[PDB]
Design goal:
2 copies of one chain form a homodimer. Chain A is an alpha/beta fold and about 475 residues long. The first copy, chain A, is about 55% helix and about 5% strand. Chain A folds into 5 domains: about 70 residues, Arc Repressor Mutant, subunit A, CATH 1.10.10.10; about 60 residues, Arc Repressor Mutant, subunit A, CATH 1.10.10; about 80 residues, no CATH class; about 120 residues; about 90 residues, Rossmann fold (3-Layer(aba) Sandwich), CATH 3.40.50. The structure holds potassium ion and nickel (II) ion. It is classed as transcription.
């Protein structure tokens, strides 16, 4: 959907994504070709970007250009900005909030001619249909086509464009939806937490705008206590009549046949239903295969299988699967893959085979999401992945006496990572040779010694103990650097 | 002893010590004023310094924690004709003065000037002098032996052996043989210090320069193999006089080689009892005030008593140019200024009350001794600092937050306590009201007064571990 942005905006977005992803230096030569533009475009984009994001710290050098600051800020800032300043997205969102308005109100709202609005809507619809089956219409003003696609597009859009704590929905306050969700939580099995609750509020508020104008999806709460208080809110706040049809339209996605809200019922269906048996079998063989290969002990196999099955049988119903501008899910999995490339590549291939064998959606967005799901549901995963990594041996010596070396060694052993094993030198003599033949990865001393091949030396004479702790801790993942 | 260096060299040295000590950004006016010199002088020192030590990098200097500061001291020793001549003379007792003129390409008149100047400087601290008729070093023998052993510890690297006349091995096997038959600690540091003291003492013993004042040793196993090495390697007869002269420092009346003997002397000698009483009240006072567990008080008292009653007998107490002991205490003092100020005052009072050496050199060394003999010091010193509370949130789902929380709680300092957000709603005010010190999130929130925010979207878990651990002593700040 980034083709809804202007050319300049699109290019600046990619420039910033590059600089946030890579901490290296970049000459304008390199930026020009990586971003497939001219050096003039790069220069113009850079100064536009400097002024738009003044907090971001840009150094220039003999080495080139880079952002120094990225660990204080976050790329969400950039998207938040390019969404906010985009004309096409703004119009689209205006239309979403104003079904039935006069086309002319849109022209007035955005200071554009009627012919310009028709050109814009034409461009918007062209971009949208590359991925989603819906379109904007001006006669009358509405969004039509595949209802599931529309609902997904906008909930995801709102999740990307607005900060987590923002509530940009003027027609619809959050409270009645919260009150409704409270009721829902008591009598159901949804996880109850801030993340899932925010996502549900966005899905539901998006669905209310559809429901208010009769745009419906093809498919206990009515007699829970409190229901009439909620039903009153909906009438008062939203002017909507809270009945069975509404409730069904709000939560349609959780009536998917192969979604199992109940874990125990899933496990029962595994025994009766040959499609479900097959899903279960594939996921069970995947999990065993990965567990044996990476020696990962897994705690609750069947619960994990249930979760993977469910995740794989939803399509454009959970947010952070498909993205508009910000592939946050994808970036998260890529960061983990940077640490553990072979592991992540193996799970992606197994899960891709799972999706393809069942003939469900097997796009990279779903492969990424499912892999992410497996990872984040797995206990002590990082411990297990690093289990073949021997401890780093650290020698500590003092030219004063051994009480000093022991004092330091004990202090560091206590405060620094248990990846390290700290020891003192126990022989009477020392020589370059006996240091070379020693097993140490790191040597800390307050006197100078010749370089010792394959040993990192920390000279500690001008370093206090606290600084030394910080310094040694920065080396805790040396083995991971192979 | 730095006044022995040329005025320029001396100033260049203090320049570098300032740079290495302080990380503060420096401009020429601060330097000139701090060093007490012209800006022309500072400009020229800087040029010279960069020329002499190319591997240093000035942007203020950014290399310091990674740089060979000993090489700095070596350099100034070597290029001091005064120090070089002093050393040559130490190794060449009885030579003709003309040999020194020849070796250093100087006239006899400038040699006599140099000697005068050396004697003038040394005399301020140590009561000995160099003589040219005949060529020898004379005066207080303990001062001489200390001066040179300490000089050699500062001028040469730990692994170097500058003594051409004397191999280390005969001396090693003597020490070995001594360790076996005694209570002396066996470790590389004390072993190196003893070798330097002894090799120094041998040069004195070889010309009959003796200290004014062991049976077992002469009938111990292997003594003849050792004594043969001494005769063949050093041209010296290993006897009761030599052994005594090699180890004189440890027959001090108030030095106690064994803890049990010290403790028996506490009951029968009123001076020893006084020493024990002062140290015991100091230790109790500091332990209660800073809540420090002292397990083996008597062992600590014994060590502090011993240390306080050696004078110019242990290296790294007084320095020639490089006050490494003092810098080590100053570094510790940077972290715990009040603790260190208290121990120094208590130990200064201990020393003054007994009327032993109470120089800042001895106060620094005794304080260093107290610190390094104490078990769990830093831990005890930080015990009132609460755990840092860390909140982890994800916009995806709570599994993600728990995955990250568990990984970070395992790998990061036990100074942290990681938790997830358990309420359904989040708001700026509930975050402000929360007790978290650090918030890790993959979604932007507004600044929350007094909370450090770490955003995680472009950071992998390993990077996140490094970033969190860098904050492990926030409270200490
Ligand atoms: K530890
Ligand atoms: Ni099978």
């Amino acid at each position: 959907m980034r083709d809804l942005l202007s050319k300049k905006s699109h290019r600046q977005l990619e420039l910033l994504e590059l600089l946030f992803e890579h901490k290296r230096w970049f000459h304008r030569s390199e930026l020009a070709e990586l971003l497939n533009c001219t050096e003039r475009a790069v220069k113009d984009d850079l100064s536009h970007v400097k002024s738009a994001f003044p907090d971001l710290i840009f150094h220039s050098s003999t080495n080139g250009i880079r952002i120094i600051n990225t660990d204080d800020s976050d790329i969400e800032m950039v998207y938040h900005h390019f969404f906010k300043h985009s004309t096409h997205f703004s119009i689209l969102e205006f239309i979403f909030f104003n079904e039935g308005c006069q086309a002319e109100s849109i022209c007035k709202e955005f200071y554009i001619s009627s012919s310009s609005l028709y050109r814009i809507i034409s461009q918007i619809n062209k971009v949208i249909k590359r991925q989603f089956q819906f379109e904007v219409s001006l006669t009358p003003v509405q969004i039509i086509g595949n209802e599931r696609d529309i609902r997904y597009f906008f909930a995801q859009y709102f999740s990307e464009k607005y900060y987590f704590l923002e509530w940009p929905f003027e027609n619809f306050s959050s409270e009645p939806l919260s009150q409704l969700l409270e009721l829902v939580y008591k009598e159901t099995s949804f996880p109850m937490n801030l993340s899932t609750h925010r996502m549900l509020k966005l899905l539901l508020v998006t669905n209310l705008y559809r429901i208010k104008f009769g745009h419906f999806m093809e498919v206990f709460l009515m007699q829970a206590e409190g229901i009439e208080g909620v039903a009153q809110s909906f009438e008062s706040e939203y002017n909507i009549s809270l009945d069975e049809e509404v409730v069904c339209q709000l939560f349609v996605s959780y009536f998917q046949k192969m979604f199992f809200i109940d874990e125990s019922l899933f496990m029962k269906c595994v025994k009766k239903d040959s499609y479900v048996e097959k899903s279960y079998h594939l996921l069970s063989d995947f999990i065993d295969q990965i567990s044996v290969k990476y020696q990962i002990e897994i705690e609750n196999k069947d619960n994990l299988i249930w979760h993977l099955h469910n995740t794989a049988h939803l399509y454009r119903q959970e947010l952070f699967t498909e993205f508009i501008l910000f592939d946050q899910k994808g970036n998260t999995i890529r960061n983990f893959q940077n640490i553990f490339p072979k592991f992540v590549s193996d799970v992606k291939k197994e899960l891709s085979h799972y999706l393809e064998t069942l003939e469900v959606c097997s796009s990279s967005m779903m492969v990424n999401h499912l892999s992410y799901t497996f990872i984040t549901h797995t206990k002590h995963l990082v411990i297990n992945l690093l289990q073949n990594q021997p401890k780093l041996k650290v020698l500590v010596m003092s030219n004063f006496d051994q009480y000093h070396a022991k004092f330091v060694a004990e202090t560091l052993s206590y405060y620094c990572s248990n990846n390290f094993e700290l020891e003192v030198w126990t022989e009477l003599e020392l020589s370059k040779e006996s240091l070379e033949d020693s097993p140490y990865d790191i040597i800390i001393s307050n006197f100078i010694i010749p370089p010792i091949e394959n040993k990192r030396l920390i000279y500690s004479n001008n370093i206090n103990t606290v600084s030394l702790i910080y310094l040694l801790n920065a080396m805790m993942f040396i083995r991971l650097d192979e």
